[PDB]
């Protein structure tokens with residue numbers, strides 16, 4: 439299509455010894471890169487924080503601001519553990535107009551500062567993928583943001599498909 443193809447999974451690193459208990463909580467969206475994310479300097483965006491909640495069954499609740507981030511509205515999905523720690527499927531629980539599931543792979547995190555997470559659509563004829571740069575604070579370092587840009591570019595994403603929203607706590 440118009441879109442840059444998704445990488446094979448083997449090109450997406452997996453965070454080693456992923457600790458679900460240490461990943462839970464609030465994560466600001468500090469960066470988002472994907473074939474369907476488009477930097478428009480004329481239309482900057484702000485994004486509310488994502489909440490990852492670990493449950494008894496080791497799945498998460500995930501509460502996140504909805505795409506394409508025009509009116510701030512939260513949504514909640516289930517993050518079902520996959521083939522191993524760090525990996526999940528994010529499923530739309532009800533069949534609705536815009537519908538796909540995503541494979542979710544935590545690429546790297548140190549739990550208390552940053553995380554980088556890869557999302558790939560499991561729908562047959564969808565190249566759709568994106569990478570989220572999360573921070574525990576609204577601000578991350580230049581080195582951490584350049585590492586996210588380089589990772590994103592290594593999967594073929596142009597720099598104008600890499601967006602840095604203004605992180606906020608809540609919808610307004």
Ligand SMILES: COc1cc2c(c(OC)c1OC)-c1ccc(OC)c(=O)cc1[C@@H](NC(C)=O)CC2
Nearest residue numbers: 467470474475488500502503504505540568570
């Ligand atoms: C847990 O966090 C996120 C999870 C997803 C999305 C997203 O970006 C707003 C997130 O925040 C970083 C998401 C992303 C891109 C999409 O297409 C470009 C889409 O159609 C759809 C989405 C999401 N669906 C909706 C309705 O927002 C599902 C996956």
